[PDB]
Amino acid sequence: GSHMASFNGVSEAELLTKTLPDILTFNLDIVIIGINPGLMAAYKGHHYPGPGNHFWKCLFMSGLSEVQLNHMDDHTLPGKYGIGFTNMVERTTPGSKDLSSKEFREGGRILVQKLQKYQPRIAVFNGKCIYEIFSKEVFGVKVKNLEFGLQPHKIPDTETLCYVMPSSSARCAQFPRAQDKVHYYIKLKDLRDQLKG
DNA sequence: CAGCTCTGTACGTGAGCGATGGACAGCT
DNA sequence: AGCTGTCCATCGCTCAGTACAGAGCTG
Fold this sequence. Notes:
Number of strands: 5
CATH topology: Uracil-DNA Glycosylase, subunit E
CATH class: Alpha Beta
Subunit structure: Homodimer. Interacts with AICDA and GADD45A.
Organism: Homo sapiens (Human)
Number of domains: 1
Shape: globular
Family: Belongs to the uracil-DNA glycosylase (UDG) superfamily. TDG/mug family.
CATH superfamily: Uracil-DNA glycosylase-like domain
Radius of gyration: 16 Å
Subcellular location: Nucleus
Protein name: G/T mismatch-specific thymine DNA glycosylase
Distance between the termini: 50 Å
CATH architecture: 3-Layer(aba) Sandwich
């Protein structure tokens, strides 16, 4: 059975009109770029609340957070950990498959402007799909075998690096557990520690 | 032919839903 | 002992991007 009970009598139609505000400041070490808000994120008004989403679990397992945090802690992340949040696409949908190419490319244009303003040390793409679109649109680059981790391009007119991880969503069968994704959060922590020294 | 894009489909975990029914206490 | 209702453990089930085959282009 489905988990519509977790929406506590709020309809899907109402959730589809909701947005998730960005959590951005200057001098951030990391900005997590999600695809777009999912239904639970639009419902809560906080990043990655999906009970199954691996984000908060991987941030703890990797040592990026010293305690197990949850979505309610997302506003504390810039000050305490140097981490911020944004999304490629603003619109709420149940899945990444409901977004058109035009929406992603409009998202990309808005995103590169936000990155050129805030200039985090590292732009982290939480999903391979959004970086494939970003790269083609911003760097004019399309490689046959896009890989995860550090990308060879910096955000134009900045020193901000691009780093790609598999989506924290548990919809992804290729990295079925938070354990299968934690390697990338550890390498992100190692890349951050290296930049800060 | 060869290589490219585009679209459709298949794919593992683990959390949490409603349904079910066993255990058990209250009350005759 | 017999009846009945609640609670809660448990089960069956749902569901939150990515890789890749193969059709359709095009050089």
